[PDB]
Symmetry: D2
Subunit: 503 residues, 4 copies
């Protein structure tokens, strides 16, 4: 909190984090035990910011017990009473917006240009669900013969959220906001690579007036995450991350018959027809691939371009990718920072190398990079990459890469591209550029994914739901549908006369 207030004089390479990062009972917990810690890095520089101390069984249980006691209070507050507190939380994140965005950049590596949008999305999501809280309700229905039923929309209990490292503060907020509005308590676990801005969110809800212990933070990796999935007093788990880990979460969660939502990755397709407006389609493909160092779940990483306009699409897209400024993320004019870790950078570079071995053409980038600026020398940098000559059987066309690597492929017909776009087990997002009104809605209808962008890419409105089809997961975040994954209906049937009985 003092670290947050010190952000206006901070810069890349200058910060060290000294706070305790575990948080329950309304306070930061002093680490002990000498548990094996893990380093947490600054992506632009490679420096160690602090050590993360992971939670074992005892720690998770304390977190959950704290959450349960606040839940007994918060679930007795009406919609309009929870709303008021949630609106104050939003107000405080707004006031501290620029400081939070800076600290976000330092741990995660994305540009401040992007980070300011993330932090804005975080407070807008809280204000949005605050707004829905007094609206929450069940039904009243008249039954045959004078009886009537009513449904009560109730909370679940303690909800656990297991988060990813690409949008740390914003994804913490996207799981806290709907949970709280519905009258639940929350325990969440940041990715161990990005543990610090999460406890600021939890502190701000306490400042805003939440019953002590309502929002709790336990740091750690797979084991800490597994404890949450196995805990007998957690009612629901919400997970964001990879397919393989999502599958395991669902399996562990089966032991207590828990509510589960899964937001997994993708290999989303972007379809560009010959009648498009080329400059908009160029902007779309760039916005589909290169935000946040290409580490974005929805990215349209298979770009299908209709044969006739392929040459002019490629010419402009390659020039624009090479022009991306890679460097210090705290500069307003930087457009790409370092990827999140060394092992991630190496895996992404490993994919490009493997693609050239399978026959792919590198039109630009796909290599390690060292910026001019000396304090950035050990950062996790690479040049954004555009691949050509790609096939549907290639590893880079089938697998989620999660770095800045666009794969471009030609197509001839709408029927053809739609089968190649849908021939996958993934189904998070997709897009289409075209000017014909029928073609635009037809293609959106036939694409098998949770979201389809028409003549744009990467918009994330709070007003509408978001989530996967097929193996990209199930459940939604944002919009009105999401309330149904954080509340449950109890059916109450009232007999107004005497009982009808066979005995």
């Amino acid at each position: 909190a003092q670290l947050v207030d010190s952000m206006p004089s901070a810069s890349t390479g200058s910060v060290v984090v000294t706070d305790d990062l575990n948080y329950w009972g309304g306070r930061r917990i002093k680490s002990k035990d000498g548990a094996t810690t893990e380093p947490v890095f600054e992506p632009a520089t490679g420096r160690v910011l602090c050590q993360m101390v992971p939670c074992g069984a005892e720690e998770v249980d304390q977190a959950v017990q704290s959450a349960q006691a606040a839940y007994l209070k918060w679930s007795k507050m009406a919609g309009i009473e929870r709303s008021r507190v949630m609106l104050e939380a939003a107000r405080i994140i707004r006031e501290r917006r620029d400081n939070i965005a800076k600290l976000e950049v330092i741990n995660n590596g994305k540009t401040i240009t992007e980070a300011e949008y993330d932090i804005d999305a975080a407070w807008q999501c809280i204000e949005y669900y605050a707004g829905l809280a007094p609206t929450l309700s069940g039904q009243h229905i008249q039954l045959p013969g004078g009886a009537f039923a009513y449904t009560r929309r109730e909370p679940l209990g303690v909800c656990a959220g297991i988060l990813a490292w690409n949008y740390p503060f914003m994804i913490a907020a996207w799981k806290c906001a709907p949970a709280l509005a519905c009258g639940n308590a929350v325990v969440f676990k940041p990715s161990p690579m990005t543990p610090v801005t999460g406890v600021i969110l939890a502190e701000i809800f306490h400042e805003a007036g939440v019953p002590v212990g309502l929002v709790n933070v336990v740091q750690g990796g797979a084991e800490t995450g597994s404890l949450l999935c196995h805990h007998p007093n957690v009612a629901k788990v919400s997970f964001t991350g990879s397919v393989p880990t999502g599958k395991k979460v669902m399996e562990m969660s089966a032991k207590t018959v828990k509510h589960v939502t899964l937001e997994l990755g993708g290999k989303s397709p972007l379809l560009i027809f010959k009648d498009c407006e080329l400059e908009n389609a160029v902007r779309g493909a760039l916005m589909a691939n290169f935000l946040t160092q290409g580490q974005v779940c929805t990215n349209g990483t298979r770009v299908f371009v209709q044969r006739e306009i392929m040459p002019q699409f490629l010419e402009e897209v390659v020039k624009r990718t090479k022009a991306i400024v890679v460097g210090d993320p705290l500069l307003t004019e930087t457009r790409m920072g370092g990827l999140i870790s060394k092992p991630q950078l190496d895996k992404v570079l490993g994919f490009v190398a493997q693609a050239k071995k399978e026959g792919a053409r590198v039109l630009c980038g796909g290599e390690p990079l060292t910026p001019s600026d000396p304090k950035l020398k050990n950062g996790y940098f690479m040049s954004p990459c555009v691949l050509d000559n790609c096939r549907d059987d290639m590893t880079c066309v089938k697998e989620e890469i999660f770095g800045p690597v666009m794969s471009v492929l030609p197509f001839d017909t709408e029927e053809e591209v739609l089968q190649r776009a849908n021939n996958t087990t993934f189904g998070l997002a997709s897009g289409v550029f075209t000017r014909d009104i029928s073609r635009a809605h037809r293609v959106a209808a036939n694409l098998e994914a949770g979201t389809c962008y028409i003549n744009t890419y990467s918009i994330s409105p709070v007003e509408v739901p978001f989530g996967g089809y097929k193996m990209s997961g199930f459940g939604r975040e944002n919009g009105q549908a999401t309330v149904d994954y954080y509340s449950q209906l109890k059916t109450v049937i009232v007999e107004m006369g005497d009982v009808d009985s066979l005995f």
Copy 2:
């Protein structure tokens, strides 16, 4: 079908079933392979009606493939076009109501008095989802700066249902109706003890005009049920059954990230306060424990009665239970038939013997029974049982028995009973009898279960949702909420001008 038309002249002990029971591609499949078969019994008499021939991997895949091709057609019909077909199905079940009910009694063993209500519930559920079909929709939302979004409500694909044996035709229908109205295809698997009325439902949908292959039936036990859960081209599984089997379903379904709904059993509590109307409470407890030979998931099998009125409750409830007529289910004045199988009868009799070993007091029944009528001598009959002197730690108070065994227990205060009623991992249903208006709504609000009945028990309206809390499962059947578990929203974001780009 010819068997169904021959029901008016049939009677207990007269029927043999000769039809093939596997059904896909719009036709009954001639068994082959010499797969090890299993006997299917008539509960009232012990006779063998036929052998069930279980499906292996090859059979399940044929069933799913037939479902997939019909799905391609049905999902292109609008709500109003699906509705018209579903309405003809419900008309055909209506017309053949009495014949279908009779055959349902012969396989399952319940009385025709109950069976007629089951079959009416089945056609009313199909008519109710038909009516919702043309109503199905997503949203249109106006977004900042001229863009707009819309959601499309879409089908899932091939849905699998795995059913239980206590309400064969009605549970088939409760999973087909919402699945079909939302535009899906279906493959279901009857319990192997009750395979025969299931394929009549599937033939009637085809008669009504469904695209060939839309509703399919595969018979078998756990292995057949596992193939469905593992099949890569099934989009959703809906299971009804025990806790332990539902856990495994959820685990197997995690391998392909499947949509899952679970309807597991219960140990539901029924709270009877001293200000109730005693006769209506007596009817309530009887209707809470003895329908369908005590083989009902919501049964209120822990009857908590306020200490002051316990003696008079017990006096009347034991006299009424002993008066229950047990015998041939095809007679209108029979009120209890045989239990479903010999092993079930034995396990149920084992619970009553075990209870008397732990201390429980048998007030009546709880023993094998041989009716006067000689054709009924090998049937699976027992006398309905009321237990007294019970404790919260007893096996019969904690475990789902699934036979006609009421456990009765005293209580002194509302705060006391509510903790003992909720101290369980089950949470299907519950009930309360009281006349004070605050007490009624307050108890119903504090009871942790999907359903609460006020001053009645065992109503099942199609108009309202039904499903578990906690370890009794998740997902709903009936009502308007259920459409959300058989359809999925796609968010389509439309950019009306030029793209906002950082690149």
Copy 3:
């Protein structure tokens, strides 16, 4: 009913109607008093079919009283019980579809090709609101400090419907279907020019099982319509007709603070941009002006065509209008019958003469016509008309004509046409033909009217709402919104503890 059954052997010029046309208490009422009657005509031939005998104060009061007693019964049936009756009504209209369509043609004059669609619309609307009936519901909301509220969705009472003559059977059904599904009773009044098919609808609901007196018919003109507006025991009036009469309805209804919905006429604009597909736009303009002899409320009677394509648009549209076969409506190849009455034909012909006096150019039609077939010689026929050289200040461009008269006008820009399309006090419908996706949605958004068709005209889905903006009326018919104009919410607040008092 015997007349309806005799339709298969009927033909133009052969029918006489001998039934009593007043209907309440579940039966046709024998006229008396010798009230001044009025002739009812066959538009194709000019023959008198029968005399209409209008209702006075005593008659209207009897109709309302009958409606009130059936309302006491029907409002006590649950949605699922109302639904079953309404579905049987739709089934009966389906079975007698062709016979009812034929009789509809004889009195109203439109072709059987169009009448079969009208009668299908009538049963589908009754089936659609049947489907909605078991869905009807209010809310359950949790309030601060333990209180809760619920809303009950209730019926209104006796609803009156005042109908037009252009879609007699269909519009009777559009007001009866939502009123009945919501639990109300109905008294309606057909146009006195088209009184006969209305009482068939009312007899069919009684056949289907409605409590006697639920649907009633009173015949008459302005006076009979005024008695309904003034009657103290009518809860709601629904009117369809002209602006000046709708204004008066609203005013008379103000004396008893009645619920009112008004569906008034229009002067709807159709915008045809140079990038359209010309043949589809030609079809659109034709379908926007000449169904039912041009006597359609939504007709796009101001056709704005972008200057560059105006010549080719006009060439094809004039050839297609002259090709329209005008003659006996009972032939399947006829495409225009006679207009409803002689005074209506004369007024429509008066508009075309006035237009030529103001400077308009007649490109075709606009004159009296005598078909070859001799039995049609006194029918109310004219040739369908296309006008050119029109201006925004002309009488024919400003006023609703309600005959087959297309006014066609050039435009140069989108901003220009939008202001001239919206510069009216009407606001019923509108249309746009264009292929650009943004232009289509943007123009639909900026047009001030209840309905916009994109790339088509005159579709009327039951699934979606329909009604006016501005002086074209308020309230809706069809879709889900319409249930809120035939039911009302009652808010019930329940205090769960002691009262908070200042006294």
Copy 4:
């Protein structure tokens, strides 16, 4: 605004109002023409606070034109952009809560204890509708043969509100909040007796950032109100007041086919059964009659008390009414202030005098009153009144008095009271006191009114809708239903293929 800031040092008898009270174009308008002004009084003292200067045709037109230009801007902002501004308006009222409450007391006369609740309701209603604005939406529906439709939820235009004097600031807010959330502009007209706090609300919206001229204030009486009703560029009128004036508003509104909602008075019934908790029922009856000097539209002014408990009800209710402290409203222990005007006080006193002439028994109060404090001598004071020995045909039992006069009547049975309670043309609110669950819900269901309170009276939650049945008006305020009276659906039908044409 400077007056508002000076409130902490203000007191009864000290204030004079010197501001201009007409407001449009974002600023207070200097009166001119020397139009005949009217005095505005301080109810506790009889002093003149200022003169009200009414608007003529020219002034109203200026206000509406200003509203129209702001509407062009605000209707292009999305829900999420309107929300942010509305939330800031709520924040500003919150901060100035106590000062605004005081000024409200000085003009209107009600106690600060009540006024603080009024001013809190006003900001909570603005915050509730802000929260709904980003939720606003239409539908997306798939139609037969690939077509699809969508509805846009659009604003109306310039909405006019005509307000009452009993809850001046709160009622201005209740009509501004839903109008503004839905994208409209607003022109409202305070009662001419209470003109001053309304222009503070309109200044606070401007401070919050509303497009200049969005919220306008025109002062005046019936003629100023008529000009709004007749104005050709006003889309909707919302009226609060008496039945006779409401009727005229509807009639005047018919000339331009305007949208109208009417909130008229009542003669609400409160039913107390012999099984109630007597003290809670006494509190109920007191809170149903004596808030805001008895000048409340929903008051339960016909108290029906079951014969057996009548004596004890009356004993406690009379003693409690006599104990009400009547005096300076700005003291925290005062519980009743002066009525609004001298003519109102005289008419109220006239009703009590007339009641005693018809046979009624005055059990307390009903007379002019002069408090001890000398600065209150000329205030409009009376003693709160309880009447006995009343009949259904009496003038005081049939007519809305709008002063502190409770009429108490005996009853014997539920069927009896229900008919006497419903035998009226009014139908705003009602209530019931009883402990039996079935009786509570059954009585609420059979009472013919927009609101029924169970075991309490006078709660006004923002979360649920509020408005009348029968001649107490139509339309709602508060809750989610109210959005449908301040927005309209446009149906957009999109043909995906070629046009189906008969021509």
